[PDB]
Write a protein that binds this ligand. Structure first.
Ligand SMILES: */C1=C\C(=O)NCC[C@H](O)C[C@H](NC(=O)[C@@H](NC(=O)/C=C/C=C/CCCCCCC)[C@@H](C)O)C(=O)N[C@H]1C
Lengths: 242, 198, 241, 244, 233, 212, 250, 204
């Protein structure tokens, strides 16, 4: 056929590219950073009414000051999460200190290109690349609140706001205009909730959507349905307001 | 050593096991249960080295429970005792052997008879009317050699036991803090919570 | 030795071997699970391409991972055994190391992981199986129903079905099960399950097998009669109109 | 590299099927027919010897009926060579079970292990599956008489009557037409012979083209017995069932 | 043609080419421009950091390998990590074992051989990054250009990446001038920034867009970003 | 070293000394023999210092990882078995540690587990481990009642260590107290044996032998 | 390096055939004829020494080989494949039997071993099946004399008599006619020489025919004396001279 | 300390007229303590008998092993194994563990089904074979058995006489050994039948 680690004439790795396609087909995930914390939002997207919507975990905790959101083939994210968590707890065991958000990110990205059928660089055993992207958000004493985008390519960027998934291209455009260095956590909460509503095929409610955030004071917390439902209501109102 | 006794009467097997756990100069516990249930009708008492003892029993437990789940059937005592003798016979010639001696007592629901098995860390297995590990045998075998009968009832057997536990408290150096007794029969495994004065 | 990457990405971002694994699931017999208010019931259909089988011995579709958790499937039979065995061992191991039997959610997440792993490990094809795992956590009475698939994804359901014509029976359940008021009885919970299977089993008293799981390791598999009876009573429901 | 010549014997078809398994079954379909009929007091195994000659030594031959244990036997359909590799590992598994538990291996336990081995070649290794299907006929004290069947896929199931190899559709129908639960061993023996006699691609059904085995519990003993018939034995029973 | 000979690196085309390696080289041209130039006292790197959105950040292009050596990249960032990290170990091994600073010329030889291994065995893939390594060792300042093919070359200056030819020509022209900027880093850095702006087009180099690295006689390889590069834009 | 822990109405009391020796040489009088595994778990240090301090910190990491993974605080019975199994993997290698894993889970209530490098894991109400264990047992054993006030129980602990610090040459320095409730444990100060001894003597009239 | 052919080179075709085993058998068909006949007190196996140049010395080569003192082999197909199989066969007879029971294996079992070798060459990774078929003849105390044929597929079966290779079809028919269950060894040797004559184009003498018999114990071929139970090998290859003398009574 | 002297026990085999006998005690102890009086040391696989003295755990292990082997042997060879062959199997099985042997002393007895000839043989712990035509001894009281046999024994005894002789050798030998006794069993083997008798002896 054609090796999993082959280069395209344009200088790209086929598997990685195709990997990015599967991601576009993934649920929406948005992240907004503010000097008051970072907000992460995801589209549950239930394939049926019988499916208990809250058994859908697309936002997980890495550590008390680090959480992430996933988009794309999510079963793939499992081992990335385990690694990220171990890396965070381990760094603590060895340095008696919290792991910096960027380093945690950089750590996950290091697994990314570890694939092939005999790549002459070490012992990269994993048949294909990961088919999921991640939004990593947290806070640390060195660079405060941070949002990161980690891809199956093995690279990562830092964003003030970023959306990945099926509605990304448009949602990102929204953020481009909406975001500003003075947003408050609440503002960002409604903004995330609003963009999810626009791009979602379904009617946004506290059951097919989910919020959460990271604040230096209480760390990473995932909003329970009630807290969210209200923010949704408060959003509909201010919208009809004009 | 610890007190590990076993007696097979007419329709059940009785297992007595010292409750003390001493470490050097101090007796750390007086309510220790040196036993593990392998299946609804199979119980195994054990005594030996500090870590090996529990690690082996639980390991054997896990495997027999797995066989039960996988086969949706309960292995006969005889078979369970054969699996255990094998595990120890492997251990004996391994890098760091398990120093654990065990008594296996169970009720064969198919033959409808109780069975008692004595197995030592070497993998020595023997089937007996009554048996014991450690020094206990030294004062109890003659008692039982004298007063034992195959058709005794569970009650008769429980008395013969009290007789043994008495001789042991009289002539044995160590204070083993009494014993915990258990009966295994057609209906399963139950503990005689009233022997501290039965 | 052999480590060819069999599950890989295609231009449109799809892992075909995993998708084809799903197709194998669609072909397998049907399986269903509905959780009541104090129990969970699993029902599976039995093929009829041949009949002269000895049901006594022939391996049944609902397996026990432990004494409080069961697992049924749809897909390749051979492949289910590998998964069942692995989960069974994990069940005992977890008891040993944590001194506490696996929760249904956990045992499920483990099985899902095995599947996901087989989708990005060289030299192996994904499992042509999807599963339904149900039971009650230790010292808990709230019923648990979970589903897993080749991709490695899993989630919980109030009721769900997998296998051939699962499209049908799911529709049936979607408009016959109210989360507000779940089959408050073991009895009416077993009924909703037979009803749902009859939508596709096409008269098969001996072609349907049920298994009810109640809190505290109370699992039992109904016999033809107990089932046949449920079928009888249901056919009158239709005629009486 | 070598990826060029790799048949990928372990992947799914777009229809969710395993090519190799499918094709291997296609292979088995041209194999001599084998039937297993389970009566109330025993089990019967019969198979048709594919390709024979005047010169073929039949007294020393055995190409379909193999003894695994003292209470378990199998009829084969597919590659004899492949069958043996598996037959031997089964005979060993049987003995290990004994050595460990000091009890004879339950018929289903032996069947499952053998089927797991096949399943393996189906999921990893880049190797071809075993072109073989088995009809296991054994007895144990936990389920008594049992009849099982396993194929290249690694799946196995239980049966009252069943056949594998060539003309199975025809054989199954004929069996499905005259099999009765209250059957007796000799009844099964006859149904067996007759079924073959009608599916045979040959002119007539002679003893020299057959293999026969029965697992009965001779009353005047109390123990189950395996008996693999000798040429002169099949010849007798052949005349009696009225096929001369 | 080419389609039958580019499926992997263990195949030669009928004209003796290794396409997989050539496609790798392509990844570099697609990468952001970066320039390197030296004198007899200092060696400089200037890079144009690229960004995703305007809400994102500008990915780092320069990595420090030791107190006397470092490099800038163009291409697959992950690979630069792998390679610079390998170069760090080699620098480290030389210190620990021989209490000796790894010579730039040797670092280059090490890189070359590592890259090469991935172009002759089945299963591997060439690296998709280009590197410009500067450093000050026992024989002065040095500048190396590393290509995925395995070819490492020592130059006075050079540039790699999209529109690099602009800067390369400017240097090729200014040669006799900058090669003599001794005892004055700020000047060599300017000649650096000028050469790189010769490859601009899209935009103009800003403060959080430009990136400078400098190593030399009494200068431990240090990096400059943002406000730090202000006095050069 | 003297460390004790007992269960009672008010939950669990944990007391330890802080003397570290190397032969007859007193290395430290300021050692922390209570490892704070987390807001609900406590570990005691007896036997080899590094062996306890290290492997117990390690246990903490393992517990944290379990909670992230299971979204549920680890049980005391399980945290004790992780330490237990780890240590048994090294049986024979020479590790030296006698420890108590203490905690309060809604599911088990107050629980104490004894864990030594021998592979021994025991659940119980009262445990004294260390070279001064018998001296604490003496005091503790004869003044224990499930019905002790959280205040009287706290004192019995402090005093049981004082007893051991006196007689045992390898124990001493200061006393460290902990109170285990479900909301977690509560530190109850560091009590320099230097002063605590005199104080108790005067106020209690005990240690009558010593000349004051 | 490193054999990257860890997958099967012999797989199933949609029709259900195993190509390589088929092609392998085709190669057996092309090979020189060789046959075997079981008498009441012996077995005989023979083939034709088809010299591949008058400059080549066909004596420096054996198509009929000794496996154990009571088992001989012969083939049809690819010479080099037979050669390595003979070595492997002799070894396995030791490693898996003589070294355990202190006695040479019985025909069926040794034959069973060879079969296993070939079967694996049918499924193992990166290899092709063996392009030969063997006619193994031998004798053991509890089974008497026997003759087996082993195919590249790894299958094998017992024969009263049979032939393989080029003129096998013709030869088989001729044998089915002459064979009976009362033949003495000499008779079979004669019949053998006859059957062989048809398949032989050119010369037919003791220097172009290779034949061996599994008959009585040759104490004279032991090499030592003084051990009652050791009676000598039953396998004996005939000499050029021995052949001709019979070719006259042909 | 000495493995071959932890459990105790003895075995002896004799040949008579068209017959062979093999006998053993029933003791199984742990040093001075007697534990079981039902531990038999004779087993058989088909018409072949095997006595095993030594460390009990190994006595059990080897029995399970030879069962396993003789079973597969019959399945492949399609006949029961003979005494002579079995001897070779035992020997190589033991030498297989040359540098960490089973602490046992095996004794083989049987009549060759095909030749009708009686056969007995002994082995040391690493497989060395001793094939006598009169008698083989083994166990903690082997010195005694040697004195007993070397005297009592005579060729071609009848099954009824050989019984007396092998029983007398066993009994009196066991009575001078603290680690042997507590019962005994004797097997008399003829080409057609096998008789197993239990003996009456001291229990001290
Ligand atoms: C409790 C005291 C106790 O319960 N028992 C007394 C014995 C106990 O093991 C002593 C322990 N002391 C230490 O851990 C000390 N550290 C060491 O002993 C380190 C030893 C290293 C040995 C390897 C050889 C090194 C040679 C170096 C030459 C320069 C103190 C200092 O930590 C102890 O006090 N335990 C207390 C908690």
């Amino acid at each position: 056929d054609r090796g999993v680690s082959t280069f395209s004439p344009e200088g790209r790795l086929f598997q990685v590219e195709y990997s990015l396609e599967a991601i576009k087909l993934g649920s929406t995930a948005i992240g907004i950073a503010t000097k008051e914390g970072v907000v992460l939002g995801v589209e549950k997207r239930a394939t049926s009414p019988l499916l208990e919507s809250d058994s859908i975990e697309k936002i997980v905790e890495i550590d008390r000051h680090i959480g992430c959101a996933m988009s794309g083939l999510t079963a793939d994210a499992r081992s990335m999460i385990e690694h990220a968590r171990t890396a965070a707890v381990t760094h603590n065991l060895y340095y008696d200190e919290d792991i910096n958000v960027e380093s945690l990110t950089q750590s996950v990205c290091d697994l990314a290109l570890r694939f092939g059928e005999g790549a002459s660089g070490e012992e990269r055993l994993m048949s294909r690349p990961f088919g999921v992207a991640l939004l990593i958000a947290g806070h640390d004493a060195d660079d405060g609140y941070q949002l990161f985008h980690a891809e199956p390519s093995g690279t990562f960027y830092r964003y003030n706001a970023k959306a990945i998934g099926s509605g990304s291209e448009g949602a990102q455009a929204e953020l481009l205009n909406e975001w500003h260095s003075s947003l408050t956590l609440k503002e960002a909460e409604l903004l995330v909730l609003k963009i999810l509503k626009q791009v979602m095929e379904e009617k946004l409610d506290e059951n097919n959507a989910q919020l959460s955030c990271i604040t230096k004071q209480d760390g990473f917390k995932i909003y329970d349905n009630e807290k969210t439902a209200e923010l949704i209501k408060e959003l509909k109102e201010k919208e009809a307001a004009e | 050593m610890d007190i590990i006794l076993g007696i097979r009467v007419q329709d059940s097997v009785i297992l007595a096991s010292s409750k003390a756990v001493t470490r050097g100069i101090s007796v750390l516990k007086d309510s220790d249960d040196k036993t593990r249930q392998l299946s609804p009708h199979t119980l195994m008492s054990f005594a030996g080295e500090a870590g090996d003892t529990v690690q082996f029993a639980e390991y054997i437990q896990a495997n027999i429970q797995l066989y039960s789940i996988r086969e949706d059937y309960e292995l006969s005592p005889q078979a369970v005792s054969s699996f255990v003798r094998q595990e120890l016979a492997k251990s004996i010639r391994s890098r760091r052997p398990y120093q654990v001696n065990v008594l296996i007592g169970g009720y064969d629901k198919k033959k409808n008879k109780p069975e008692l098995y004595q197995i030592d860390y070497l993998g020595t297995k023997v089937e007996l009317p009554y048996g014991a590990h450690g020094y206990s045998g030294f004062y109890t075998f003659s008692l039982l050699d004298h007063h034992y009968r195959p058709d005794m009832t569970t009650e008769e057997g429980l008395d013969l036991l009290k007789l043994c536990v008495q001789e042991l408290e009289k002539r044995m150096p160590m204070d083993f803090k009494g014993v915990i007794v258990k009966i295994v029969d057609k209906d399963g495994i139950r503990q005689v919570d009233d022997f501290q004065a039965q | 030795g052999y480590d060819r990457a069999l599950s890989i990405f295609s231009p449109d971002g799809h892992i075909f071997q995993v998708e084809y694994a799903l197709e194998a699931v669609k072909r397998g017999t049907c399986a269903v699970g509905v959780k009541g208010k104090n129990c969970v019931v699993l029902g599976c259909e039995r093929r009829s391409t041949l009949k002269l089988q000895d049901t006594r011995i022939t391996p049944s579709k609902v397996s026990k991972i432990d004494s409080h958790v069961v697992l049924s499937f749809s897909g390749l039979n051979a492949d289910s055994r590998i998964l069942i065995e692995k989960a069974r061992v994990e069940a005992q191991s977890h008891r040993l190391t944590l001194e506490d039997p696996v929760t249904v959610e956990y045992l499920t997440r483990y099985v899902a992981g095995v599947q996901q792993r087989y989708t990005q490990s060289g030299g192996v094809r994904p499992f042509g199986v999807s599963t339904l795992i149900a039971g009650f956590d230790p010292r808990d009475d709230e019923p648990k129903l979970y589903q897993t698939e080749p991709s490695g994804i899993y989630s919980s359901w109030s009721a769900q079905t997998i296998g051939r014509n699962s499209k049908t029976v799911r529709e049936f359940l979607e408009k016959n099960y109210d989360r507000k008021e779940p089959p408050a009885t073991v009895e009416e919970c077993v009924k909703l399950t037979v009803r749902s299977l009859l939508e596709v089993v096409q008269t098969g008293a001996k072609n349907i097998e049920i298994t009810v799981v109640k809190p505290d390791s109370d699992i039992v598999a109904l016999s033809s009669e107990e089932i046949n009876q449920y079928v009888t009573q249901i056919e009158q429901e239709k005629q009486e109109q | 590299g070598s990826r060029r010549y790799d048949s990928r014997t372990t992947i799914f078809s777009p229809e969710g099927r395993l090519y190799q398994v499918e094709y291997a079954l296609e292979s088995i379909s041209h194999a001599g027919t084998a039937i297993g009929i389970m009566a109330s007091d025993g089990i019967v195994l019969a198979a048709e010897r594919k390709v024979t000659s005047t010169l073929l030594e039949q007294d020393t031959s055995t190409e379909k009926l193999y003894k695994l244990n003292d209470k378990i036997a199998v009829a084969v359909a597919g590659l004899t060579a492949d069958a043996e590799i598996l037959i031997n590992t089964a005979r060993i598994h049987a003995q290990n079970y004994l050595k460990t538990y000091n009890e004879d291996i339950p018929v289903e336990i032996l069947v499952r292990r053998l089927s797991d081995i096949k399943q393996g070649y189906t999921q990893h290794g880049g190797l071809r599956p075993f072109g073989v299907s088995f009809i296991y006929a054994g007895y144990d004290d936990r389920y008594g008489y049992q009849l099982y069947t396993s194929n290249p896929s690694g799946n196995y199931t239980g049966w009252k009557a069943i056949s594998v190899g060539a003309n199975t559709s025809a054989a199954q129908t004929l069996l499905q037409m005259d099999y009765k639960d209250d059957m007796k061993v000799d009844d099964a023996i006859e149904l067996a012979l007759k079924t073959l006699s009608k599916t045979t691609d040959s002119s007539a059904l002679t003893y020299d083209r057959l293999e026969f085995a029965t697992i009965r519990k001779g009353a005047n003993d109390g123990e189950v017995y395996q008996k693999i018939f000798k040429p002169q034995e099949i010849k007798d029973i052949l005349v009696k069932t009225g096929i001369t | 043609f080419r389609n039958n000979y580019d499926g992997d690196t263990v195949t030669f085309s009928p004209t003796g080419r290794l396409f997989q390696v050539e496609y790798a080289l392509e990844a570099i041209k697609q990468g952001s421009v970066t320039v390197g130039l030296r004198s007899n006292t200092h060696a400089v790197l200037v890079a144009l950091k690229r960004n995703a959105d305007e809400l994102s950040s500008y990915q780092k292009k320069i990595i420090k390998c030791d107190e006397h050596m470092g490099l800038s990249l163009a291409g697959l960032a992950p690979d630069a990590r792998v390679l610079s990290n390998y170069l760090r170990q080699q620098c480290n091994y030389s210190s620990l074992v021989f209490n000796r600073k790894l010579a730039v010329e040797r670092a280059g030889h090490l890189l070359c051989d590592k890259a090469q291994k991935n172009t002759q065995s089945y299963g591997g893939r060439p690296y998709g990054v280009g590197l410009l390594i500067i450093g000050y060792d026992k024989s002065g300042a040095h500048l190396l250009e590393f290509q995925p093919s395995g070819n490492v070359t020592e130059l006075y200056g050079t540039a790699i990446g999209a529109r690099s030819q602009g800067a390369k020509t400017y240097l090729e022209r200014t040669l006799d001038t900058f090669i003599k900027i001794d005892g004055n880093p700020d000047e060599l850095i300017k000649a650096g920034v000028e050469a790189i702006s010769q490859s601009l087009r899209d935009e103009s180099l800003t403060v959080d867009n430009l990136s400078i690295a400098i190593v030399g006689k009494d200068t431990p390889f240090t990096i400059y970003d943002g406000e730090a590069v202000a006095k050069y834009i | 070293t003297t460390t004790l822990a007992f269960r009672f109405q008010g939950g669990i009391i944990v007391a330890v000394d802080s003397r570290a020796t190397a032969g007859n040489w007193v290395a430290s009088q300021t050692v922390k023999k209570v490892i704070e595994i987390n807001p609900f778990l406590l570990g005691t240090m007896a036997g080899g210092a590094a062996d306890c301090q290290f492997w117990e910190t390690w246990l903490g990491s393992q517990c944290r990882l379990h909670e992230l993974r299971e979204k549920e605080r680890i049980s005391v019975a399980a945290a004790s078995k992780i330490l237990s199994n780890l240590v048994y993997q090294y049986k024979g290698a020479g590790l030296s540690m006698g420890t108590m894993i203490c905690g309060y889970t809604r599911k088990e209530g107050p629980t104490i587990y004894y864990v030594d490098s021998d592979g021994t894991r025991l659940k119980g109400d009262i445990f004294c481990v260390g070279s001064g264990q018998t001296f604490a047992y003496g005091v503790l054993d004869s003044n224990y009642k499930w019905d002790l006030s959280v205040e009287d129980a706290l004192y019995l602990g402090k005093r049981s260590i004082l007893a051991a610090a006196h007689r045992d040459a390898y124990s001493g320095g200061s006393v460290n107290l902990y109170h285990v409730t479900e909301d977690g444990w509560i530190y109850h100060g560091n009590h320099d044996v230097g002063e605590l001894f005199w104080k108790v003597k005067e106020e209690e009239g005990s240690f009558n032998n010593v000349i004051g | 390096m490193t054999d990257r052919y860890s997958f099967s080179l012999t797989t199933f075709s949609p029709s259900g055939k195993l190509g390589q085993i088929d092609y392998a058998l085709t190669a057996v068909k092309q090979g020189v004829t060789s046959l075997g006949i079981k008498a009441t007190n012996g077995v005989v196996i023979a083939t034709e020494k088809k010299s591949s140049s008058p400059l080549a010395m066909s004596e420096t080569l054996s198509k009929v080989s000794l496996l154990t003192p009571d088992i001989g082999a012969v083939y049809s197909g690819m010479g080099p494949d037979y050669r390595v199989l003979v070595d492997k066969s002799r070894k396995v007879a030791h490693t898996s039997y003589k070294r355990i029971y202190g006695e040479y294996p019985p025909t069926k079992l040794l034959v069973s071993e060879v079969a296993k070798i070939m079967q694996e060459a049918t499924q193992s990774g990166g290899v092709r099946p063996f392009g030969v078929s063997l006619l193994i003849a031998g004798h053991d105390e509890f089974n008497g004399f026997s003759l087996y044929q082993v195919d590249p597929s790894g299958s094998y079966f017992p024969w009263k008599a049979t032939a393989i290779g080029k003129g096998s079809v013709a030869a088989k028919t001729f044998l089915e006619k002459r064979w009976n269950d009362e033949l003495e060894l000499e008779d079979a040797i004669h019949i053998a020489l006859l059957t062989l004559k048809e398949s032989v184009e050119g010369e037919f003498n003791g220097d172009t025919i290779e034949l061996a018999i599994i008959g009585d114990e040759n104490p004279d071929l032991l090499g030592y004396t003084g051990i009652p139970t050791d009676k000598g090998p039953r396998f004996r290859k005939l000499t050029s001279q021995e052949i001709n003398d019979r070719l006259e009574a042909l | 300390s000495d493995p071959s002297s932890i459990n105790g026990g003895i075995v002896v085999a004799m040949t008579g007229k068209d017959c062979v006998a093999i006998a053993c005690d029933l003791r199984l102890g742990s040093q001075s303590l007697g534990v079981s009086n039902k531990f038999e040391k004779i087993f058989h696989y088909g018409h072949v008998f095997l006595g095993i003295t030594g460390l009990a755990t190994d006595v059990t292990t080897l029995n399970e092993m030879f069962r396993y082997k003789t079973n597969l042997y019959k399945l492949k060879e399609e006949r029961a194994i003979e005494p002579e062959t079995f001897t070779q199997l035992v020997s190589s099985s033991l030498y297989e563990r040359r540098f960490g042997p089973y602490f046992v002393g095996p004794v083989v007895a049987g009549i060759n089904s095909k030749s009708g000839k009686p056969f007995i043989a002994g082995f040391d712990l690493i497989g060395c074979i001793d094939e006598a035509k009169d008698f083989i001894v083994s166990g903690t009281a082997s010195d005694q058995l040697f004195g007993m046999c070397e005297s009592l024994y005579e060729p071609n005894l009848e099954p009824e006489d050989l019984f007396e002789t092998i029983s007398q050798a066993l009994l009196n030998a066991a009575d001078r050994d603290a680690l042997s006794g507590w019962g005994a069993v004797v097997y008399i083997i003829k080409k057609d039948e096998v008789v197993k008798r239990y003996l009456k002896m001291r229990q001290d």
